[PDB]
Amino acid sequence: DYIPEPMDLSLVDLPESLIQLSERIAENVHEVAAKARIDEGWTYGEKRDDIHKKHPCLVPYDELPEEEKEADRNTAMNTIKMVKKLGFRIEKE
Amino acid sequence: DYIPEPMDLSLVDLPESLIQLSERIAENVHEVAAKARIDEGWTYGEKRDDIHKKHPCLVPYDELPEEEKEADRNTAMNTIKMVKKLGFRIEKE
Numbered sequence: 367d368y369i370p371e372p373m374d375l376s377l378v379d380l381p382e383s384l385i386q387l388s389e390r391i392a393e394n395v396h397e398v399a400a401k402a403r404i405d406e407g408w409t410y411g412e413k414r415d416d417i418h419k420k421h422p423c424l425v426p427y428d429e430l431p432e433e434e435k436e437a438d439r440n441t442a443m444n445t446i447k448m449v450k451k452l453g454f455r456i457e458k459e
Numbered sequence: 460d461y462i463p464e465p466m467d468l469s470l471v472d473l474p475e476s477l478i479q480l481s482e483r484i485a486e487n488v489h490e491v492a493a494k495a496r497i498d499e500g501w502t503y504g505e506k507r508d509d510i511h512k513k514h515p516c517l518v519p520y521d522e523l524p525e526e527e528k529e530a531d532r533n534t535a536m537n538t539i540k541m542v543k544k545l546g547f548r549i550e551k552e
Contacts, residue, residue: 368519370497372490384547391541394466398537401463402530410461414509426461437495444491445538448484454477455550456542 378447383458385443392438393427400424471540476551478536485531486520493517 403421411420423430430438450456496514504513516523523531543549 368493368503368517370490370494372494373487381547384542384545387545390545391538394541395534395538397463397465399534400461401465404463416507424461441488441492442538445484445488445535446542448487448535449477449539449549452477452480452483453552454474455548455552457548459546459548 373448373451375444375447375451378450380443380446380450380456381458384446384456388439388443389435391442392435395442396423396427396430396438466541466544468537468540468544471543473536473539473543473549474551477539477549481532481536482528484535484539485528488535489516489520489523489531 400423403419403424406419408419408421408424410422410424411418412422414421423434427435427438446456493516496512496517499512501512501514501517503515503517504511505515507514516527520528520531539549
C-alpha cells in the first residue's frame with residue numbers, strides 16, 4: 367500500500383560548475399557513510415552480511431562499481447535539486 | 460588499509476530556514492531511493508533479504524525508525540554543507 371511519490375525535479379537547473387563537482391560531493395557522502403559503518407564494527411566483505419557486519423561498499427570511493435558511483439552522484443544531485451526546489455538560490459561565490 | 464577521511468564540515472553554517480526543511484529533503488531522498496528499489500522488484504519485509512529482495516525501508520518516510528530519519532536528515536545536511544564548502548552560496552530567495 368506504499369507507493370513512493372518523489373517530487374518532480376526534472377525542471378530544476380543547477381549551475382554547471384556544481385554538477386561538475388558531483389563526484390567530489392558523492393565521494394564525501396560515501397566517506398561519511400563508510401566511517402559510520404566502520405565505527406559500528408563493519409568491515410569489508412565481497413558479499414553483504416549483516417550477522418558479521420560485512421559490506422562491499424567499505425572500499426575507497428574510486429574502487430566502487432561505476433553504477434554505484436553513478437547512483438551516488440545522482441543521489442547527491444537530487445538532494446541539491448530539492449533544496450533549489452524548496453526556494454533556495456545556489457550560486458558559485 | 461581503507462580509512463575513510465570525510466571533510467571537516469563542522470564549521471560550515473547553513474541558513475536556519477534550510478535546516479528547518481531537513482525532514483522534507485530527507486523524505487524526498489527516501490522516496491527516490493524507495494521507488495528505485497521497488498522498480499527493481501524489491502518489496503517490504505521486516506528483515507532485510509537480498510535473495511528475496513525484502514527491505515524494511517520500503518515504508519512511508521514517517522513510519523521509519525527515528526534513528527533512520529535522523530541519519531537521513533544528517534546525510535542530507537552533510538551533502539548540502541559539502542556544496543557550501545566547495546564555494547557555493549546558499550540563500551533563501
